[PDB]
Amino acid sequence: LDRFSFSVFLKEIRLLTALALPMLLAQVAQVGIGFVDTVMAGGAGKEDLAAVALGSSAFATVYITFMGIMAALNPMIAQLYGAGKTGEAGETGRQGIWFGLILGIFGMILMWAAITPFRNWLTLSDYVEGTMAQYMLFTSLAMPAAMVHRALHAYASSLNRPRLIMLVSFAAFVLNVPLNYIFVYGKFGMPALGGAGCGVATMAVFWFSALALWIYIAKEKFFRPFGLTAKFGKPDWAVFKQIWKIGAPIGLSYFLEASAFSFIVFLIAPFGEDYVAAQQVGISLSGILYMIPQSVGSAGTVRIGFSLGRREFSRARYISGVSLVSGWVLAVITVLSLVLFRSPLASMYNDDPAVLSIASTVLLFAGLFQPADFTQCIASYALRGYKVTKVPMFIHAAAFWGCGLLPGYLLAYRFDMGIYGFWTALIASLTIAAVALVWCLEKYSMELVKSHKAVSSGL
Amino acid sequence: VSSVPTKLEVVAATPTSLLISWDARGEYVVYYRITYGETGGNSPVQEFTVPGSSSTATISGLSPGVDYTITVYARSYYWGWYSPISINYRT
Ligand SMILES: c1ccc([P+](c2ccccc2)(c2ccccc2)c2ccccc2)cc1
C-alpha cells in the first residue's frame, strides 16, 4: 500500500534502438486524411450556410466509434505475424473485411435512421435547422460507412511493415480536393447539390481508397484470401466473434471522447457563448497535432502484440516502455508549444471561424490534461494494443467520464477563472490514467514472466 | 557431433496439463521423444513422442500443482539422439 503498480521504471537496458519509426508513417498518412477534412470545410465555404460539419462531424460519430472495433484487429494480424499463414491471419482479415462491410453496413444503416436532428431542447449549434442540405451529407456521405470500414480494414492489415497507406491516403486526399468541388458546383459533373456534395465528394474517395486495398495485393506475397468471406461454425462463427471482445471494449472506449464530445459542446451554451466557443479552436488544435502523437502507439500496437507471436515476451512489453516514453519525449517537449503559443495571425478563420478578438483561456488546459494523457491511452494502444487488455480497459474509460462527470458542472461553480475548471478530475479522472492502465502494464509486463516459462536455452 | 533442440518455453498450462512449445528448426532425420516426470524422482518417467519441426506440443499433465520437469529429444542422421534439453517449471 505504497506501490501496487509493481516495478514501475524498468523497461530499460540499451533500448535506445527501439526503432518504431515506420510506425509514425502509420499516422502521417493520417494527417493525410485528417487534412481532406478542412479542404471541404474551407472548400464548402463557397456556400456560407454550408457550415456542413453539422452532419459530417456527427456522421464521424459512428465512424470513429465502429472505427475502434475495426482498428482492434491490429493485435490479431500483427500477433499472427508471429505464426505463418497471412491467409489464416487473413481469413480473419477477410472475415473482418466481412465485418468491415458487415458492421460497415450498419454505419451505412444506423445512419438512415440517424437523419432526424429534427429535434430540440437547448441552444443553436444543436437544434435550430431551416434549410438542411445536411439532409444529404447525412446520406450522400453516410451511404459510404460500408466501404469505409473496409477502407480501414486496410491499415488494420498494415500490421506488418506496410505503410502502403501513406502512399495512398495522400494520392487519396489529393484526388478529393479536385473531385470535392466538382460536386459543390462543378463541371460536366453532377454540378448542383453543393452542401452535401462536398460529402458525396468525400465519401466518393472512401470507395477509391477502399480499393487501395485491392491494388495492394501487389508488392509481394498475398493478403488476399477473398473467397466467400462466409462464416457459420458454432452458433455463430468467430474469428469474427473473436473480433467481438476486442471490438466492444474499444469503440465503447472511443466513446470516451464521444462524450468528451458532449462535454466540450455543453459548455458553450450557458452564458459561456463567446470565448467559451473558442475552447474549440483550442481543442480542435488538440486533435490536430495530438493525432501524430497519440497514434504513434496505435501504431506501436503492432511492434508489441506482433512480437508476442515471435515469442519475445517483454523483449517487446519492455519496448512497450521505450516506445511509450519516446513520443513521450515530445509529449511534454511539445506540450510546450501548446500552453505557450496561440491562435495568432497564424489563424485566419478555418476549421472553426473564430479567431481575431478572443481570450487565451484555452491554452490553460493544453498542459493540464494534455501530456497527463498524451500517452495515457498510447498506454492502451499497448494493452489492448498488446493484449486482450482492452477487456475492461473498457472500464479504463468508465472512469474518465464517471471520474470526470462532476468536473462537468465544476467550471460552472468555480473558485477562480474556472474555464479550465471542469478540467478538474477530468485532468485527474484523466491522470488516474497514469495508473489503472500502465498498472496492468506492470501487472502486465510482469505477465511475461509467468508466460516466458523457459527463461532461455543452450548452444 | 552436435547439441540440443535449443529453445525452451512452456508459456502456460491449463493448470492441469501443459503446452510445451520449443525449438525444432526443421527436424533432423526426424523425431522427438519427450520425457515425462516431476522432479520428485519418484512417480516414474513417461513418453510423449512427435514428428516434424514439432517439439512444439502439449502434455496430458495429469496431477495438480506438483513440480514437473520435462525434456525433449532430437533424433537424426544416426537413429540415435542429437542431444536433449530440459526445463522443470510446473503448474
Ligand atoms: C463533435 C462534432 C464536431 C467536432 P469537430 C472538433 C473536433 C475536436 C475538437 C474540436 C472540434 C471536428 C474535428 C475534426 C474533424 C472534423 C470535425 C468540429 C466542431 C464544430 C465545427 C467544426 C468541426 C467534434 C465533436
The CATH code of the domain that includes B5 is: 2.60.40.10
- Residue recorded with cell 467559451: A276
Residues facing residue B33 across a β-bridge = B49, B73
Contact assignment for A457 to B6 by CB distance below 8 Å = yes
Residue A329 DSSP one-character state: H
Three-state secondary structure string covering chain B = CCCCCCCCCCCCEECCEEEECCCCCCCCCCCEEECCEECCCCCCCCCEEECCCCCCEECCCCCCCCCEEEEEECCCCCCCCCCEEEECCCC
* CB < 8 Å to A455, chain B: 8
* CA nearest to A431, candidates A368, A364, A372: A372
**Cα separation, A178 vs A407, whole angstroms:** 44
Residues facing residue B57 across a β-bridge = B20
Strands (E), A248-349: none
Residue A362 DSSP one-character state: T
Cβ of A220: how many Cβ atoms within 10 Å? Answer: 9
Helices (H) and strands (E) in chain A, counts: 21, 0
Grid cell of A447 as nine digits: 505477465
Cβ of A19: how many Cβ atoms within 10 Å? Answer: 11
- Residue recorded with cell 533500448: A15
Point out the residue among A450, A451, A456 whose CB comes nearest to the CB of B8.
Answer: A456
Residues facing residue B37 across a β-bridge = B69
Measured in angstroms, how far is the CA atom of residue A350 from the centroid of ligand 1?
12
Grid cell of A335 as nine digits: 506540450
CA A186 to chain centre: 32
CB under 6 Å to ligand 1: residues?
A: A 37, 53, 57-58, 261, 280, 283-284, 286-287, 351-352
Grid cell of A148 as nine digits: 469505409
* CB < 8 Å to A458, chain B: 3-4, 6, 85
Spatial neighbors of A247 by CB under 8 A, at least 6 apart, are A68, A69, A70, A72, A99
Grid cell of B30 as nine digits: 526426424
Residue B85, domain extent: 1-91
- Residue in A38, A256, A281, A284 to alter for ligand 1 test, most ligand atoms within 8 A of Cβ: A284
Measured in angstroms, how far is the CA atom of residue A351 from the centroid of ligand 1?
8
**Cα separation, A425 vs A410, whole angstroms:** 9
Q: Domain total for chain B?
A: 1
Residue A58 DSSP one-character state: H
**Cα separation, B75 vs B32, whole angstroms:** 6
Point out the residue among A451, A458, A459 whose CB comes nearest to the CB of B12.
Answer: A451
Cβ of B15: how many Cβ atoms within 10 Å? Answer: 11
**Cα separation, A59 vs A206, whole angstroms:** 14
Cβ of A362: how many Cβ atoms within 10 Å? Answer: 23
* CA nearest to A153, candidates A167, A165, A143: A165
B80 CB burial (10 A radius; 0-12, 13-18, 19+): exposed
**Cα separation, A203 vs A143, whole angstroms:** 8
Contact assignment for A453 to B89 by CB distance below 8 Å = yes
Inter-CA distances, A350 with A126, A141, B14, B71, Å: 20, 21, 58, 68
**Cα separation, B67 vs B38, whole angstroms:** 5
User: A308: nearest CA in chain B?
Assistant: B11
Residue A178, domain extent: 1-459
Residues facing residue B19 across a β-bridge = B58
Residue A194 DSSP one-character state: -
User: Do A133 and A55 form a contact (C-beta atoms < 8 A)?
Assistant: no
* CA nearest to B85, candidates B2, B1, B6: B6
Contact assignment for A455 to B6 by CB distance below 8 Å = no
Grid cell of A397 as nine digits: 474509460
* CA nearest to A53, candidates A256, A333, A351, A282: A351
* CA nearest to A184, candidates A172, A175, A193, A176: A193
Residues facing residue B73 across a β-bridge = B33, B84
Give phi and psi for A306, each to the nearest 5: -70, -50
How close does chain A come to B71, measured CA to CA in Å?
A: 12
Cβ of A262: how many Cβ atoms within 10 Å? Answer: 10
- In single-letter form, the type of residue at position A359 comes to A
User: How do B13-14 and B84-87 pair as beta strands?
Assistant: unpaired
Measured in angstroms, how far is the CA atom of residue A284 from the centroid of ligand 1?
6
Q: Domain total for chain A?
A: 1
Instruction: Estimate the crossing angle of helix A104-114 against helix A62-70, to 10 degrees.
Output: 160
Measured in angstroms, how far is the CA atom of residue A57 from the centroid of ligand 1?
6
Give phi and psi for B73, each to the nearest 5: -140, 125
**Cα separation, A58 vs A405, whole angstroms:** 22
Cα angle A133, A139, A140; round to 5: 80
CA A190 to chain centre: 33
The experimental method behind these coordinates is: X-ray
Contact assignment for B85 to A450 by CB distance below 8 Å = no
Residue A295 DSSP one-character state: T
Inter-CA distances, A297 with A216, A245, A294, B41, B83, Å: 24, 20, 7, 49, 43
Would you call B38 an interface residue with chain A, using a CB distance cutoff of 8 Å? no
**Cα separation, A63 vs A142, whole angstroms:** 9
Measured in angstroms, how far is the CA atom of residue A204 from the centroid of ligand 1?
21
Inter-CA distances, B78 with B2, B29, B30, Å: 12, 8, 10
- Residue in A134, A137, A291, A351 to alter for ligand 1 test, most ligand atoms within 8 A of Cβ: A351
